[PDB]
Amino acid sequence: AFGSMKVSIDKDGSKVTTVVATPGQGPDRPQEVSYTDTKVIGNGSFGVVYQAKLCDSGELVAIKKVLQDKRFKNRELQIMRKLDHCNIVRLRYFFYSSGEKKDEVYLNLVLDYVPETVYRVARHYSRAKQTLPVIYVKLYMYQLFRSLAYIHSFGICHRDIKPQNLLLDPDTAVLKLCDFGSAKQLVRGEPNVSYICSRYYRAPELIFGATDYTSSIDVWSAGCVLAELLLGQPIFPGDSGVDQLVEIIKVLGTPTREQIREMNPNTEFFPQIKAHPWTKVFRPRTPPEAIALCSRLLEYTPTARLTPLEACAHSFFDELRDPNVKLPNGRDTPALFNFTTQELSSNPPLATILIPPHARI
Amino acid sequence: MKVSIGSKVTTVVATPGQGPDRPQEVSYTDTKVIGNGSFGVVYQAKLCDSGELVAIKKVLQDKRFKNRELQIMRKLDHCNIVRLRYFFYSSGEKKDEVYLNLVLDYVPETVYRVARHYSRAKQTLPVIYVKLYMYQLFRSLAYIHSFGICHRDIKPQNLLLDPDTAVLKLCDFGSAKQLVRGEPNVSYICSRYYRAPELIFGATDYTSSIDVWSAGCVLAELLLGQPIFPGDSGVDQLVEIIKVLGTPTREQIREMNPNYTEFPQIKAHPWTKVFRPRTPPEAIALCSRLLEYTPTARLTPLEACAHSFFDELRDPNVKLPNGRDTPALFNFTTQELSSNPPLATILIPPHAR
Structure with missing residues (x-):
């Protein structure tokens, strides 16, 4: 509720604000900032x-x-x-x-x-009618999955994954997930609002006001970003839920009766079409492993989707596990391998693949 | 489909939309x-x-x-x-x-194209057109609702205009449904700036009043030059709504979706302060009665046609900017008036035949 802040005018003299603030992490050891x-x-x-x-x-x-x-x-x-x-x-x-x-x-x-943000990068390239080099796509996507594996491990769902929410350092290529204003810790048994996620990135089950949803919504959303980086434009656009489900169906095919029950809590019910060849979706020289990744993230059934940790271990990321891999500007990549026990708790045997031989030495 | 030739001429056996099922070569x-x-x-x-x-x-x-x-x-x-x-x-x-x-x-044309042109020129659509268009939309709603049919996708793209006559026509019927009591409906229907609170919460027991809110959103946006309740997200949409209408009361919230116990305590913003200062009071008042949390509280289309804001339209000396007479405004039918026939005496003024 309390605490004051002071406003001295400098020798220049710029406005200086001084507050007494709590540290984010650490114990309550207030600091003059x-x-x-x-x-x-x-x-x-x-x-x-x-x-x-x-x-x-x-x-x-x-x-x-x-x-x-x-x-x-x-x-x-x-x-x-x-x-x-x-x-x-x-x-x-x-x-x-x-x-x-x-x-x-x-x-x-x-x-x-x-x-910088993924949004702005993707757009810059998209404006110029160019494609983001796959190597950044791998970097950025991989790092996002780490953040998801981490927060999910505490049962926390972001609920708002989109490109504006993925910050980038331009030189290092480090990605930091931001804006936890919609995040909530999900308790199985307790229901959640369904109107949380942003529009291109909502999982089908959200689009149907499901309230029993799980963390895999973030994975859907993340699969949407990947595909957008590959395509240079959103994969599932529409001003309306109906519009968006059309697009989804166009790509995934027609949800099974059982699947439609999973999402909509009523079965029940107005569209119909058959399964799109996923490879007809992207530009022709798009990496097949990327397309695979997409299909495993963008599944109708929530439990069919990869966990963040499993996506981190996917083929499409093999290049980041290469010991020679460097950024385009020839610095090293960021640290991608200092996994914690927390981070792997979903499934520890995965460190086996996640952590390359060279990183153990 | 029989294709012939110039240049290219197609010929089909097509069935009239109205009347008897008798197809013709067209x-x-x-x-x-x-x-x-x-x-x-x-x-x-x-x-x-x-x-x-x-x-x-x-x-x-x-x-x-x-x-x-x-x-x-x-x-x-x-x-x-x-x-x-x-x-x-x-x-x-x-x-x-x-x-x-x-x-x-x-x-x-469409109301969306036309609204944009004005907004790019940093002008507002003159209030007379706002009256003409909104009224005509409200008629169109009064009509469809009288058969118990909801459009479910009222938005500026879906309102077509003829510029010379100022006729407006409602148009995109792909999400429309004749609603029935106790039969549930999908909640994913309406387009983003135009979605009613209950929709934003996946209510499935909603009424025709979803369209009315959507109309209220169109009105406000024509007054303001931009959407009144924007957001990439249900949350963002609700925040904007709340800013304008205050925080809902507890049952207002339960009304939208039951499961929702479930919000920030924002005080209601004087409607007066939401708009440019030149803005006609009667329009604002109409807004406030269309854009209500409780569905049963908002005006019926018909009641909206009858609102003081539309009175200039009932003036016998009213004319279009281009000098022409107004289009048809008063040729109501019984079917159209079923909701509330005594309104006839307002809706059909003395000079109208």
């Missing part, structure tokens, strides 16, 4: 998003101001405090302040500022 | 593709016979069931609804496979 160059860069649904500079290190950061319900505990924050992973945006600090000349208090989350 | 030329819909292509062509221009919408036909869009189109006859002139079967794709072809009035 001081920043300047405050600009609005996004404005999210629930409040606003600024960029700023830390006065000492000079590093840029992002600050997400959100209205705070005095009544209850904040679900985004509580999750962001649990999570610690090289492919997940980091919560450096949080604190409470007052906007906005009122009774109301705002929660501010201080985060790694990353300018 | 011929047409000048055959362009002019859209790919989800369910398939739309063409334009000219009837050799009358020189009139028409749209032919083609869809794959499963012989397993009768086509619902067709069943519905053959029921309808109204000046604010695109007319089905003929239909016919063909196998344009090489297979034992059947296409249904709907031959429709061709209508040049």
Whole structure:
């Protein structure tokens, strides 16, 4: 509820804001953090998003101001405090302040500022009528699956996987999953809203307001991003659920009676067609292993889909396990192999493939 | 499908949309593709016979069931609804496979195209056109709803306009359903900015009022120059709605989907402050009565036709910007008025015949 912040004008003199903030991870050992160059860069649904500079290190950061319900505990924050992973945006600090000349208090989350996103990259290439080199597709997709394997291991579903939510460092090629505002920890037995995911990336079972859904929704969504990188445009577009199910059906074929029961909780019910050759979908020199990956991620039945961890171990990623592999700009790839026990808990025998001979030495 | 020659002339045995099932030889030329819909292509062509221009919408036909869009189109006859002139079967794709072809009035523009042009020029559609168009949409709804039929996809793309006459016609009947009590309906039907709260929560016991909300969204958007409740996501959509209408009360929420105990405590935004300051009060008031959480609380189409905001339309001196008379506004039928006939005395003003 409380804590103050102060506003000194410098020798230059820039506006400097100094707050007393809690660390993301670690114990409650509050810290004086001081920043300047405050600009609005996004404005999210629930409040606003600024960029700023830390006065000492000079590093840029992002600050997400959100209205705070005095009544209850904040679900985004509580999750962001649990999570610690090289492919997940980091919560450096949080604190409470007052906007906005009122009774109301705002929660501010201080985060790694990353300018680039998969969205913007994919689009740049798409505008130029070009294809993103497969090697970035492998990098980016693989790293996303790590983040999913990790959060899922705690029973947390992101619920909002899309390209705008995958941040990239341009030089390193590191991907950090961001925006955990829809994430929730799923308890089997307890139901969930069905209107959570964004429009190109919703799993068929969501499109039918299922509320008993599992974490595999993130895998569907992730399969959508992969395909989009391959195709240079969304695979399942439509302004309407109906429109989107048409597209899906066009590619997967006609859901079986039983499958249609899995998703729609009623069977029941208006479209019909037969199974698309998956290979007719992509450009002709598209890697067959990529197409396989897609089909195993974009399954009607939720349990038929690969787990994140299994996708990480898929053929299409063999090139990242190569010891010689480097980025186009000839730096090394990011760390792709320092798996934790947590990260492999879904299925530990997979480390066998995930961790290449060379990485053990 | 018998093809002949110039240049190219097609001749088919087609059945009139209206009346008795008596097919005729019908011929047409000048055959362009002019859209790919989800369910398939739309063409334009000219009837050799009358020189009139028409749209032919083609869809794959499963012989397993009768086509619902067709069943519905053959029921309808109204000046604010695109007319089905003929239909016919063909196998344009090489297979034992059947296409249904709907031959429709061709209508040049849409409210979506027209709204955009104004928005790119940084202007608003003049309020008179807003009145003309919205009213005509509300008639079209009053009509279909009186047979208990919901459109389920009311959006600016689906409202066709003739610029010279200012006639509007409702048009895309592929998601329409005659609703019945206690029979559930799919919840994935309506397009994104236009979806009613209950839809956003996968309600399956919804009413015809989904269309009304959708209309209310069209109205607001014409007033504002942009969608009123945008988001790539149900969540985003709801946040915007809530900002405007306040937080729903607990039963309002249960009404949408029961399972949902389940939200942020945002105070209702004065409707007055939502719009440009030049905006007519009567329009805003109409908005607030169309865009209501509780389905039974929103206006019936008919009640909407009767609203003070539409009064200028009832003026005997009303004329179109281009000098012409208004189109038909008052030729109501009994069928159209069934919801509430005493409204006739408002809807049909003294000079109208």
